[PDB]
Design a protein around this ligand. Sequence first.
Ligand SMILES: [Mg+2]
Ligand SMILES: [Mg+2]
Ligand SMILES: [Mg+2]
Ligand SMILES: [Mg+2]
Ligand SMILES: [Mg+2]
Ligand SMILES: [Mg+2]
Ligand SMILES: [Mg+2]
Ligand SMILES: [Mg+2]
Ligand SMILES: [Mg+2]
Ligand SMILES: [Mg+2]
Ligand SMILES: [Mg+2]
Lengths: 199, 190, 247, 138, 176, 109
Amino acid sequence: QVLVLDGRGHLLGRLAAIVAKQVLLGRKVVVVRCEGINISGNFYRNKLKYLAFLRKRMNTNPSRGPYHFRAPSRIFWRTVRGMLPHKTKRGQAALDRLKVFDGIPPPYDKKKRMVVPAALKVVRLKPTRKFAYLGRLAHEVGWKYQAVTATLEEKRKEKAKIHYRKKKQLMRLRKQAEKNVEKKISKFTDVLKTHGLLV
Amino acid sequence: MKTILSNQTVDIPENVDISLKGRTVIVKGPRGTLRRDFNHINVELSLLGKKKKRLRVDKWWGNRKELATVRTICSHVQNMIKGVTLGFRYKMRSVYAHFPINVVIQENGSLVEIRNFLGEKYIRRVRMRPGVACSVSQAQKDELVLEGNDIELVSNSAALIQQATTVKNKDIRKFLDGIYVSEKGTVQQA
Amino acid sequence: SHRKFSAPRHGSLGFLPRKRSSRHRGKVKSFPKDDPSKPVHLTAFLGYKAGMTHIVREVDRPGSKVNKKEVVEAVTIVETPPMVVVGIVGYVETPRGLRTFKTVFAEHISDECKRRFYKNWHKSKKKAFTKYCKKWQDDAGKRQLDKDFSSMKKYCQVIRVLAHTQMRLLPLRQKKAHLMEIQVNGGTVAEKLDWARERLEQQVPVSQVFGQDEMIDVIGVTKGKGYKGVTSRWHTKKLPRKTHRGL
Amino acid sequence: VFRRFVEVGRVAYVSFGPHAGKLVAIVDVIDQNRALVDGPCTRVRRQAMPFKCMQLTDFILKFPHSARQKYVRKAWEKADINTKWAATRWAKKIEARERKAKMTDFDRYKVMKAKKMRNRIIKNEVKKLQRAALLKAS
Amino acid sequence: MKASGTLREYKVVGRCLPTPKCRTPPLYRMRIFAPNHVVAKSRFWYFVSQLKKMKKSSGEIVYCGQVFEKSPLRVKNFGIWLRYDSRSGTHNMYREYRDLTTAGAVTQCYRDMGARHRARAHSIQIMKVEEIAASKCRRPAVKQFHDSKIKFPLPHRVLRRQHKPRFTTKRPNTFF
Amino acid sequence: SGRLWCKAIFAGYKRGLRNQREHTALLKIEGVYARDETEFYLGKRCAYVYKAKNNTVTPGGKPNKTRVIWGKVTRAHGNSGMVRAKFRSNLPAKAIGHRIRVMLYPSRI
RNA sequence: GCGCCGGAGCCUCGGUUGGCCUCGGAUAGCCGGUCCCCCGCCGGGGUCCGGUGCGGAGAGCCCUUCGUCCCGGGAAACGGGGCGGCCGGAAAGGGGGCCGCCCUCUCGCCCGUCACGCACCGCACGUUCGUGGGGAACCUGGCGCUAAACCAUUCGUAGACGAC
RNA sequence: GCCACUUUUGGUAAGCAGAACUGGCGCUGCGGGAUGAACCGAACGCCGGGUUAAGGCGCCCGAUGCCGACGCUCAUCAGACC
RNA sequence: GCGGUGCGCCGCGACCGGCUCCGGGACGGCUGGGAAGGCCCCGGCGGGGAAGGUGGCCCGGGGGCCCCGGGUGUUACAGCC
Ligand SMILES: [Mg+2]
Ligand SMILES: [Mg+2]
Ligand SMILES: [Mg+2]
Ligand SMILES: [Mg+2]
Ligand SMILES: [Mg+2]
Ligand SMILES: [Mg+2]
Ligand SMILES: [Mg+2]
Ligand SMILES: [Mg+2]
Ligand SMILES: [Mg+2]
Ligand SMILES: [Mg+2]
Ligand SMILES: [Mg+2]
């Protein structure tokens, strides 16, 4: 009863638009690997937009001003907060439901992370428009932890490769087993084929 | 308009054998192997003929600024096959007015120390990007010969040393000093 | 309207929360970045200020007007007894920073260092690490320790060794010793923990850490001067004599 | 590299629209994005059809680009498409989708009671193959 | 006029009133294009006011009917002569479309003028729509379809039906 | 011995931008997302089930803490399969984004 | 008087009504095998063979709850349930796999046979996660523990007072 | 007294001053124009059901989560509704 | 038993009427007494036309008789008007 969304290949505010309404309707949504979120438009326009957000600062005491978060997780958290009614109790309950991480931490490396096709770069951009990675933008604007995230990601992609070879060889044992037992399951198989489950 | 189809082919000689792995192309031949990754250009690359003699690049439904890119792949692959089967050689001449420009070549072709340019004491160390070898020529007074496979690496390493020898704060039209690219061309003639 | 005569700004905004320091001894905000091609060495030490003195030395800088002449120079004597190493701390690099992994203390911790764990050494019964130092003289405790050393060898990235001053040898009033994490910079993590657990529980002098004529950085809180005003603190220009509510 | 091409005389399964679920034969190309089309042996009347609703398949039957519905019907049932489609593994999984959508309550129960043992037998055969691989290893 | 929906072609005829100097006037006829016969009769009196000395009151409609397309199953080329008013000065034009029906190509004409030139349907003034054979065409965007062996793939099939699987785990495919 | 109610979420009241009308709940039912598809649920008894502090009765049983506010599903809403319900006492805004059960039993099948 | 494991019930806060245990990723390209072939610490790739509106399908997969009783068929047998060791986990560490024992069953599953179980007399919050989270007192045992903080005094590296 | 369509006088001009016609505000809520005396819609007893106007329908925020239709458009200062 | 009135509280159903938002059938009129299309050229007889030119013919190359281009031209072993 928790939506584990992936973040790679998704447009920033176009993912945040679905996430905002889906959290106001009561889900607990965990958008994971947020540094792989990309934004449309080219990287120099996008970092000029974020540097303009940096210079927008309370003049007399910038401690009270806009907290320009630098990590990609909290950039995406700030844009979901912009799309939620967060001055009030239901918007604050929604922000309490949304959890947002950089990379894939170990409550969620073992779980199967979802996608949103409606907010995805190969669906909602022309293939010749330039885009901009939010992780690289965050690193250019002052996020400190790109390199440690990338090394932890190559570690988890190795360990996921191990899990995937194990799952492949289990699936191949399953197909050799079904080939070896079709003589005494082909009566059970045949009524799953007449109801459209194996054709 | 959105033009329905535009294509060009690339004739391929016999001593070489291109192979395309999806959209990145890998040219192997006499001198060395080199690749280039066309995954930014959104076209189709057929490899046709047996002996694989032709590379067809075609683009379907392309407007003007994208049909511009349908023969620039042909130009990159033509320059690619040229640099594989023949290699590239840029000879660049060292022009001075009074102070002679002293060039020494360290790390067997990979770093260039330029000295005495305009009488400056700041010595210039320029590193060739990999695969390019700089060399002082013979039977000619002031040359630097840049050998390599592909022109982007070779001509980039040439432009680095040309912009390294530059005149600042004075009249660039009178003070015609520096090392300038004179003779682009080939290692082995065909 | 603007300011008639431009003039640079009093004070620095870089040091801006000009409050009392939240800690008495100066903390190293950043140790030097390690490279594994060094031998293993300590990147900090901890001495106490004593005073000031002249010297006379013959300066060798060629070209200068004081070449081969003899300047005098103010020096500062930092009395610096050998610190005793007591524990090691390991750190794992996380996408939220660098968290601590597993602090490991030695068996015999001297009462110099034991006073640091107590706000009141008189009223207590001096009970710190009594349940902990039974983990060194039994087999289950020793191989639990070898388990966490093996976990520190493979999950930690930065290793900081714990060291305290040796306060008996100092003429001060106090006895409660200063404890400090010193980062061990040097070779790979196996070499680093082997060095650290071999030199665990024993001393290290200054000459293991620094050398003669080595530029260092000095960290500490300044000399406190109390609640003071803008002329005394920010060095603004005093308003003239005729001012009604104070100048 | 592309292997399904819009041209004169391909059949295309239709995704949505008025005529969802049928094959058509593309006759001519009106625009960048619209095509004159006719499925004459499946009751799709000769009409225009956009490309966005039609999924072109690997059946090229030849006829001229202005041929009438008579000649498209002739080439259709000369090639005998309507059995090649019903034997194609596209339409087999289409009609399988349609079957498990058409499934009633009682046979949903019968499917469940079947597939429970149909998974039990594979599951213990798979674990005995796992221990047979471990005995091969040992 | 609002170019609402696909247009229809209206053959509409009209004449001045029976007046005692000429008791039977001539009858005039227009091919006009309009969403329905009400706005069609209004466009008729607009153009006949532009051409003759004839108005809503000094004349009458006679037959306002539809021209059905006479071969809607043969793809044809249409040449369309226009007259539109820009932000600065009006211009005569010639555009070419390719469609099954005549009113379909004029619907495509109004939408193409509104797309490219921002010309709105009160400003756009039609004058001549003709079916043009496949060699008299002047425009490359139409002439590129004159191929008996025309052939092209459908390269980048961008995923429509985005929100039926809204939280999926498949990455979508676009090579079909 | 399992669930006999469809899952629905009290999205909000029937409202405008500067006005809400609390007599009509907006219910978002799981799985149905079009007006072509919302037709099955019209007229179904829906219920907001909640617990409380002190015990109240429970018919066909003994008193416990749980409580209801019954209703019915009146008419579709929008194009995304959102629907309107009317409850016999208006729902508290406590219930925003909490599970309203929507039953099956006024069947028309 | 406090932590730990080894039963009855009582207040209070409430949400919830089966799980999905994971390749990386491409998008003018993918997925899965054999490896016949070549090297590296099983993997990397060429080659061939299948799928590709994805069926090794999230349009999906697993689980499938009325219960027991007789006996029969298919299924299992090398299986189910019930004590000690081996390791696998660090980014915010997994109620996981594996070697034996002494126990005990042909019961679990799929088709049939046989009857029985308040059939509470048409009627709503049922069915769970649930030994839920927190709070007091009744508990019967066992191995473990019997500390600091603050004031007051002093210091003066600190100081308006606290603070240090 | 003030504002607005259109006509109009002085003034370079003005959220300036001075007129004509009509409608408004003042005396007036309500939906929309984010915000707002005058603009767009619409004028009011207290309610239930239905339906609209002007304006909208990614999310804040009811409504496009249409497999909407045809194009133009790259902005290192994009554009976005009397 | 009949007639009136009400149930202590919480609920359900049934039909009848009013007002509505929908959904499924079915029948007919008008038009250019609809425009097209369907089946009986490879609808019938004969006459033409040209191309987004099919056969064939030639030229060119990719092959193992097919495909790909370019030219000629008028039904041929496709069709269109
Ligand atoms: Mg000068
Ligand atoms: Mg100034
Ligand atoms: Mg005075
Ligand atoms: Mg409950
Ligand atoms: Mg005025
Ligand atoms: Mg009035
Ligand atoms: Mg008013
Ligand atoms: Mg505004
Ligand atoms: Mg008006
Ligand atoms: Mg109302
Ligand atoms: Mg709005």
